[PDB]
Amino acid sequence: MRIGIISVGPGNIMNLYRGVKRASENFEDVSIELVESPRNDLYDLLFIPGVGHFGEGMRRLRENDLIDFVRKHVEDERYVVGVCLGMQLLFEESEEAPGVKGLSLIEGNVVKLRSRRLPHMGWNEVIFKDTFPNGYYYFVHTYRAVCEEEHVLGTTEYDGEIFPSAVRKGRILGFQFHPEKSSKIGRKLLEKVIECSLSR
């Protein structure tokens, strides 16, 4: 197994790179690569990290030739994982940047949250439908996914508002929180992602 992580997008991504690195310490067939350009190919697990403006990142996969390289990972029945902004991509559009088409790998768009205390920041409970462990993870995000109760994988509530912290469309997972900033359970989450990816 080789895991690849898109190293281009906005915000800090080396925090995810370790922690995924940390999580695969228990696996033998495992190797982790920073993916800089579409050249290398292909990975079993591909991570889409990032934090920032929806437009940026759409702009950075884009000039670095990674939209097509992602398009082909999802196709060839490989695990593609978008984390934080990486989850907010994947969909059609954000109101954080009107116009830009996103990745559109899951049907839905992106809206601001409806709370007057933003961003959503801190430890919040996440309830999973299945597979991944339940409990508190760590959040920093001002935008939210809109998808159909089918691609929803995990739900969280901030200031009255329920919303999906995890998504799953087959072999595409998305996670809004930072698993790399969630102490013990966050490694367990990332370990279970890896365990899901050996089954293809």
């Binding site: 920041m121 001002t142 102490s183």
Partner: protein
């Protein structure tokens, strides 16, 4: 709802934990990195590092600390202590820090709160406010509690929220180093002036002080010595608070 937080404060100088710890189980219990790693394992929810190196080399010293801590820490951490301008804040975050603490430089320039928040978000800005009663009024002191700024605390908290601060670290100068309890009267005074999360700080002596400070409206409780020298077990504390109605983060084993 959102978890009430327990936070470990690590006073550092020259890359080491100023007055050390007492955690027999690490080898080099003055290594801020290994102590941080440890505090995550027992369940501390956040770390703040506060550096008091010497002004000439303080900046390189902090950047060396942030880098070394980012390669190995799996929880949010804040750095602070003599962060005096935007440049000397942008570099620590990009170097890896999750948040910056600004204090005197925020009093002497409110504009830096917005400047930091503008290119990193309010979430990256902690304003440390140091208060002390002066003639029956809460006042903001700077230069490690040496200068009465003459500013009413009550005003200063609305300004910093205004300027774009994300989190307030509220230290009652009266109660730092006392082990007699958090300044709950000062926490209760500040609580309705703002919807920003408040980290209570100064005076932790025993578990019940945490309960007290949460009844006072704190969102997070900071402490150092009580943890570093094993006077309070993090898990005991959290289980204590969970028992008495505080929504802390407490996972099963």
């Amino acid at each position: 709802m959102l978890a009430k937080r327990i936070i470990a404060c690590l006073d550092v100088k020259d890359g080491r934990v100023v007055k050390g710890t007492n955690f027999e189980n690490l080898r080099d219990s003055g290594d801020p990195v290994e102590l941080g790693k440890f505090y995550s394992e027992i369940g501390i929810d956040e770390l703040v590092f506060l550096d008091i190196t010497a002004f000439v080399e303080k900046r390189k010293t902090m950047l060396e600390l942030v880098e070394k801590v980012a390669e190995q820490i799996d929880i949010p951490f804040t750095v602070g202590g003599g962060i005096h301008d935007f440049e000397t804040a942008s570099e620590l975050i990009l170097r890896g820090a999750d948040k910056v603490s600004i204090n005197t430089a925020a009093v002497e320039n409110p504009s830096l709160i917005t400047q930091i928040a503008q290119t990193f978000g309010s979430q990256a800005v902690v304003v440390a406010i140091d208060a002390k009663r002066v003639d029956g009024e809460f006042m903001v002191f700077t230069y490690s509690g040496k200068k009465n700024t003459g500013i009413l605390l009550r005003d200063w908290v609305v300004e910093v929220e205004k300027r774009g601060a994300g989190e307030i670290l509220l230290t009652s100068i009266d109660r730092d180093g006392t082990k007699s309890g958090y300044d709950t009267e000062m926490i209760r005074f500040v609580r309705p002036l703002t919807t920003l999360p408040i980290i209570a700080s100064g005076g932790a002596g025993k578990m019940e002080h945490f309960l007290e400070a949460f009844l006072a409206g704190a969102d997070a409780a900071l402490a150092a010595s009580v943890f570093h020298f094993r006077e309070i077990d993090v898990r005991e504390l959290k289980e204590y608070l969970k028992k008495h109605g505080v929504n802390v983060r407490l996972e099963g084993l």
